[PDB]
């Protein structure tokens, strides 16, 4: 019983002026997890807080990129173990469901 996993990442792209949504493909994949992690680790250094809202200036949308892997296990429940290991090996550890990992 070759199981499947769904590693999902969330994002929200700034809509370009008069662009077909078929563009956002790029806008979607240019901003993967690693990029989000190093962007958070980089802004922290010169980060200053201000109450004044800058979020209400433009129009944009929210979307998700999910990828899927597969594995075969002789045992039913052992699969998850491997998954977790592999996640720690190459992926972010989101919340887990039955298999689905969500970071958002």
């Amino acid at each position: 019983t070759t199981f499947k996993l769904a590693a999902c990442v969330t994002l929200k792209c700034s809509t370009y002026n008069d662009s077909i949504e078929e563009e956002i493909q790029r806008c979607l994949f240019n901003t993967t997890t690693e990029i989000r992690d190093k962007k958070q680790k980089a802004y922290a250094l010169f980060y200053k807080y201000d109450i004044v809202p800058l979020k209400g200036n433009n129009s944009e949308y929210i979307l998700i990129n999910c990828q899927t892997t597969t594995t075969e296990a002789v045992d039913a429940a052992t699969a998850a173990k491997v998954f977790k290991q592999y996640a720690n090996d190459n992926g972010i550890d989101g919340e887990w469901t039955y298999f689905t990992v969500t970071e958002g």
Epitope: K38, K39, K41, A42, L45, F46, K48, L54
Partner: antibody
Framework: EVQLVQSGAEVKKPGESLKISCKGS????????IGWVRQVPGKGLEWMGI????????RYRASFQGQVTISADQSSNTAYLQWSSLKASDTAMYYC????????????????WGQGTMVTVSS | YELTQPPSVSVAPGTTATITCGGV??????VHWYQQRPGQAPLLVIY???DRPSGIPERFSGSNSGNMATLTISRVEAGDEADYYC??????????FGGGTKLTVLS
């Protein structure tokens, strides 16, 4: 326009203090860092210092510590750089540049630049 | 922490140019790219590695990998000749600039 304007060029002698300015318009002064960068003619860019006026926080370079001073007048939306004593090695073009404060909406790099001010020290 | 930019870069007009910025584990941070024409203030042409300020055409692309950042220029025009610098914000060293790379469009 979101713009920054720097004071006029100056020629001085070693030992005399000097203060130069950077006045920005078109945006909220305290919501953005102001950085000062040095460029000896024919050489790279040398980041000297940076100031956040909202808290008055300042951060300098190891080398440019004892030499220079940075100030921020929030009331006039103005940044200032100063030497107590000048040297020859300080002869260069000086640039002041705005820098986002670490928010996704703003640009987190030196987006707006000034015209630059030439400081020439020669006995 | 130093940045290794190449001194000179030269390509023919209308061809794609690349500019390199070598850092130790540089992929673990965000690199920005600035343009400076001789005698004029610098201009932010790329930030967050790939993003483009307004008024910058699609001709400018950026990328970053483990130990090498790249800035790519498509449809090169004689108007893009100038000095290009890479810059980061290190955990300890604050702001660092690349040595600077002169780009020339061949005449």
């Amino acid at each position: 326009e979101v713009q920054l304007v720097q004071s006029g060029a100056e020629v001085k002698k070693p030992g005399e203090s000097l203060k130069i300015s950077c006045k920005g318009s078109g945006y909220r002064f305290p919501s953005s860092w102001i950085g000062w960068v040095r460029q000896v003619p024919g050489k790279g860019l040398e980041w000297m210092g940076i100031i956040y006026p909202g808290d008055g926080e300042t951060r300098y370079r190891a080398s440019f510590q004892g030499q220079v001073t940075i100030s921020a007048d929030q009331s006039s939306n103005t940044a200032y750089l100063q030497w107590s004593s000048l040297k020859a090695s300080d002869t260069a073009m000086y640039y002041c540049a705005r820098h986002g404060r670490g928010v996704r909406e703003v640009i987190n790099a030196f987006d707006i630049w000034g015209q630059g001010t030439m400081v020439t020290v020669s006995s | 922490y130093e940045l290794t930019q190449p001194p000179s870069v030269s390509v023919a007009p209308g061809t794609t140019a690349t500019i390199t910025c070598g850092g130790v584990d540089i992929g673990s941070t965000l690199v920005h790219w600035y343009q400076q024409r001789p005698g004029q203030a610098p201009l932010l042409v790329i930030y967050d590695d790939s993003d483009r300020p307004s008024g910058i055409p699609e001709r400018f692309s950026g990328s970053n990998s483990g130990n090498m950042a790249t800035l790519t220029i498509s449809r090169v025009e004689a108007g893009d000749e100038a000095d290009y610098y890479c810059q980061v914000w290190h955990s300890t060293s604050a702001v660092i600039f690349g040595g600077g790379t002169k780009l020339t469009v061949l005449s």
